[PDB]
Amino acid sequence: RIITKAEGVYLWDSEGNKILDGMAGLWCMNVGYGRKELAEVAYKQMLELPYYNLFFQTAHPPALELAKAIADIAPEGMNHVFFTGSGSESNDTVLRMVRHYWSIKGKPQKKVVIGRWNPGIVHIAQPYWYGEGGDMSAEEFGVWAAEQLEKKILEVGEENVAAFIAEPIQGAGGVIVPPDTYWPKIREILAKYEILFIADEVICGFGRTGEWFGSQYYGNAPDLMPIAKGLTSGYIPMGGVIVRDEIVDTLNETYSGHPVAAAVALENIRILREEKIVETVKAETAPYLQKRWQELADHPLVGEARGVGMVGALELVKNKKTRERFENGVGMLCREHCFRNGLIMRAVGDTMIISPPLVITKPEIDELITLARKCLDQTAAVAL
Amino acid sequence: RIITKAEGVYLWDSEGNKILDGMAGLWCMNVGYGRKELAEVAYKQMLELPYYNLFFQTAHPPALELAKAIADIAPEGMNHVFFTGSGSESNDTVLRMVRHYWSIKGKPQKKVVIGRWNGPIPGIVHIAQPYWYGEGGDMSAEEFGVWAAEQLEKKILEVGEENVAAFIAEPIQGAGGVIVPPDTYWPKIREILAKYEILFIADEVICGFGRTGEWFGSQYYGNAPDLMPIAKGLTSGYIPMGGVIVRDEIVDTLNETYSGHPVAAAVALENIRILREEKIVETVKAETAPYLQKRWQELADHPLVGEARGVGMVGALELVKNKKTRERFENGVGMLCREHCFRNGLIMRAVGDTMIISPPLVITKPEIDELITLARKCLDQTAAVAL
């Protein structure tokens, strides 16, 4: 089976079957497929002035306009953006920035970066209530998971710690939506220590939560935000790091951004802004998606349905009260039914996930929900 | 000065003045500016199937064809390529691979990578660069080549082989001043590498995709590296992309994100196709580079020029105040020469008091003549002011 075209939220195989791409390529095709404007802007920039030269610049350098355009939608006080080739490059880049920052402040011992489960890096607990909450409520567990950050800081010693790094919501790990008490508690902990906050926005960035950034959805004011994916809606490779102004001022005592990529990202943000795609997500599309997605919680196979904005997860279990999982693996089986039925929904163990294009319509959401329920029924038949 | 269009080797500013881009953007615009084919393939890939999806493969995935295309021109035995977003990403990637390699072989202590000055970063140490003009002292070129290579063996023993993962080196150091090593350098390095347990990383970000007249600098000098970071010339700078080309034995071990974005890959595939089917690299080797290097030597007669050197489609000029002693001017001259270049419409980079070129590979013999005329003018104007 072979893909020959794509348009909106749909792929078409060579036969003529439409597949609803519920994962937006790789959490990235935010304006959907077939957006001619993006190809046209790339084409023109490539012919006109594809790249930099050592002496002189162009009329309206797209990278500069892009940086201003991102400065206008980023959290307040984050008006610098350093461009890269990719999201993984942005993650390497942020780790270097944080270490250089503290080194320039005269504290080169602050090297350790604290991340979350799922070589100068240590890990704390992820705020995954369903899998790791034990006997606690969501609210209590959110507090506890946040407190693991303070505990790790003290254990490693503040004077050895550079930064905490975290996605607002962990994507690839299973759309792990944290309790509402998680981020407020983390902010309290960050306020007490000398530690930079890296908010990894590679997935959540450019509209995915209904705000421009996951950080704005939860009310976080980070120091650095790696971005990619939604930056270009996956149409051309590009990454970046958005940086709080004070951090840059310190750093001021390769990242220009390729003009073709920058032209595409600028047009992509323009479309997201001028067609009110992120506004529509917040006001209409995401509330509708999350409401319909909850209906799947009734399904005999589903232990929990969760989500925020345009992401969601379903936990597939054998027993809803104990959260006991099936032997072997229901997720792989459910995925195969997804594959057969023409719905792209990723399996992460026994967790099913979606991340559709942000332009997905209410009828398209209905289709997604119908296909998902069908796949859950077929999986239950085989498993229950 | 503001650039409004570009074509072949030329930029045009808003007033219609032509600037000869002697640096090929940043050592990367190998097929020149204005190659419609590259924009067309990007456009079509972007509209049709811009990216991966989780379930089903695409008709003719450009990244797979690109990997085959690079396997066909890479040094022999290097038939795997891992894609990245950029050359600096490829350099991070390759340092991780060499450390993972030795870790999988059961020797996670081999972590240290030996590079060269002008090539703190934990896990990297540096040896001497084979820069005869600046650091050759009282040695001949041939003997200094040997000595600079021997510093690698000395560093290996000093660090201890059991702590060493790899040696990393460009065939010719580009950004450092087109430091062309003596002919005895690479053969001696190969002898040293053969005696130790050490991977050879040949950094081809600049030298790659035709710049020396071979596809890779490694082929120009007869090296057989284990890993080669690439970027730039991969797409001729039209779309960001990087990669790492890896020797098959290394991969077999490693087998005990790098897919390459389809739009970039379509452009790189078309770019290599053009370089191959128009015989651009062959023409460089047989015609263009010999002509460039011959004309570039003529500037050695200039009162300001202590040495002219180059290989393929790169070159350097050393600006000195006294040709007999190699004494340099009091804190300047490179930037002054660059300002004259800027004014006269030639892009030549200044690295200290070393002037450097790296033109597009499609540059013609009349264009080379123009470059040489402009360079000599810039040297005259610089001498007038400084000598």
Ligand SMILES: [Ca+2]
């Ligand atoms: Ca702002």
Ligand SMILES: [Ca+2]
């Ligand atoms: Ca052969």
